Amino acid sequence: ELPEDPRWELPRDRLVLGKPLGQVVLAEAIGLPNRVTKVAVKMLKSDATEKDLSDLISEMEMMKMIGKHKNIINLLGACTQDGPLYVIVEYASKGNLREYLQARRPPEEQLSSKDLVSCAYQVARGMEYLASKKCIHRDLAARNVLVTEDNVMKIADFGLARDIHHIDYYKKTTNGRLPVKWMAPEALFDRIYTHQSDVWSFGVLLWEIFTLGGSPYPGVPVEELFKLLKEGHRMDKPSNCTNELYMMMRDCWHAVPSQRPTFKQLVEDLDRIVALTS
Amino acid sequence: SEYELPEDPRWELPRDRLVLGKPLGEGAGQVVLAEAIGLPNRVTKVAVKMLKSDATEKDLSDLISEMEMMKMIGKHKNIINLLGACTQDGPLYVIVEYASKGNLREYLQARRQLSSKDLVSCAYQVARGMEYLASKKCIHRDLAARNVLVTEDNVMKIADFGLADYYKKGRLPVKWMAPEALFDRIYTHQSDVWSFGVLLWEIFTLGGSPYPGVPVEELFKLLKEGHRMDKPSNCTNELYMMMRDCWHAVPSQRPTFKQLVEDLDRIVALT
Ligand SMILES: Cc1cc(Nc2nc(NCCc3cccnc3)ncc2Br)[nH]n1
Ligand SMILES: Cc1cc(Nc2nc(NCCc3cccnc3)ncc2Br)[nH]n1
């Protein structure tokens, strides 16, 4: 092997490896000079192939290009020399947005309307940035958004190497859901991924926020999903969700990609709506 | 029954006093609109169930028992009532009330304009219809908005309450069955209560389709998982908890129609 790179390189002895987070491990980074920062550390299994290294490296290099933003999982450093590759990224202690929301359901301290609307604003900001840095996510969902101790939304997995011409549509998320339910049609049937298809996925993310971790199309298998999509079926409006916000998800789910709003626009509308939401 | 049906003068209408009309709908049976006369020279618009020309003995006998079930059950404002029959010297006609505005699903869907009260009132009426039926030992087994007809004057009338394959569809009726009815083939008044839950969900989604895209094998999965549909929008948390009450995994914990009528009475007056 790996080229050295002093902009990012951290000494192996400056990193105290702790509990597995699920390999991604929690760690402590001394310096970054006599203070420690909790960080998460991406690494490879023993199992691993040369393609897996290739992928971790790509991911890290992408993170290098895209630069920093409050609302993405930032790269903090890396251990690349005389040992296993460690990619050091920001740690987000309260898990993925899906879990964080589900846990705050009524029977923990519940979330206000303002909080839910504020969640969506932060993800729409993270997305605007990624978009402006020419990056297309392809799997935007609540699960790939994380929450820090301070309740800050952080888009994760945005640098990921994934050969789209090899997606297993029948494969389930670790929690039992099917990724295809976040995919814009044209991505799904035609494999055309744009900022526009991400916006479709933001639509479903909004739905998740406002049903507090709801599952899109429950018990709807793949073949039936395609039918719902081809028929132009749109999900029902969540309760405790406003028409204006329901219009937004609908607008994100416009059939014609060019007519969907952009993230720049969404960030403006969310800014306006957070301010007026109780 | 091959050559002649049993006479019952109480209900017999002479055929000259009935003028058949536009078909209303076809089934496994047939229903036609008709103009009946003297139920004494007044024309009443009525609905006329009858066999199709490919019926068997068994099909006729079922139509008969359906008619006889209606006689045993008796009249109520919120059901489809027996008005008469032609049983002699020709095909069997079972004359029942005509509901000019079709089934509740369609009715709701055509009006997406009913107020919050109109909707609750609708639910009240259905539940009365069911309390009555229930008090007469009658278990519907397919209670759903599609089997509630609506009249010119906007009254709800339970249809198919007198009737005699999970994949037959273009929705799946299994999506209305109680778990015990589905899995244990137990059919009680409380298994209709569960269906009433899904009907309430239809009402307040204004003809919504429950579990769209979910096939039979996945639906079994969900019920087992204790999965319940989400509170519709434009639905109070108490109306939605009525639905959840109806959807209790234990039948005896469900409310009764008697209970539902009393609850829905209260809520109608307060909407
Ligand atoms: C990268 C990161 C993870 C966390 N916090 C947590 N992470 C996990 N595991 C998520 C697995 C993963 C792998 C790659 C990208 N995203 C997530 N579990 C619990 C927590 Br808390 N902060 N930062
Ligand atoms: C018995 C009856 C039917 C009507 N009016 C209408 N009926 C249909 N199809 C009736 C078949 C049916 C429906 C529900 C339950 N059982 C049988 N279509 C339109 C109308 Br209007 N009035 N009285």
Q: Which one of A105, A220, A222, A228 would you mutate to disrupt binding with B, by most B Cβ within 10 Å of its Cβ?
A: A220
Nearest to A88 by CA among A145, A2, A16: A16
Sheet holding B93-97, edge to edge: B18-26, B30-37, B43-50, B93-97, B82-86
Domains and CATH numbers, chain A: 1-91 (3.30.200.20), 92-275 (1.10.510.10)
Using CA coordinates, name the residue in chain A closest to B232: A239
- Nearest ligand 1 atom to alpha carbon A92: 22
H/E run at residue B18: strand B18-26
Concatenate the DSSP letters of all residues of B45-106 into one string. EEEEEE--TT--HHHHHHHHHHHHHHHHH---TTB--EEEEE-SSSS-EEEEE--TT-BHHH
CB contacts < 8 A (A, B): 45
| Alpha-carbon gap, residue A218 to B220, rounded angstroms | 12
Resolution (A): 2.5
User: Choosing from A55, A139, A198, A269, which is the catalytic residue?
Assistant: A139
Amino acid at B45: K
CA distance B232 to B18: 45
The answer to whether B120 touches B239, Cβ cutoff 8 Å, is yes
CA A30/CA A88 separation, integer angstroms: 12
Chain A positions in Cβ-Cβ contact with residue B208 (cut-off 8 Å): 236
The CA radius of gyration of chain B, in Å to the nearest whole number, is: 19
Whether A90 has a binding-site annotation, put simply, is: yes
A246 contacts in B (CB within 8 Å)? 233
Is B233 an 8 Å CB contact of chain A?
Answer: yes
Residues of A in contact with B211 (CB under 8 A): 218-219
Q: Rounded to the nearest 5°, which phi and psi values hold at A275?
A: -50, -35
Q: How far apart are the first and last CA of chain B?
A: 53
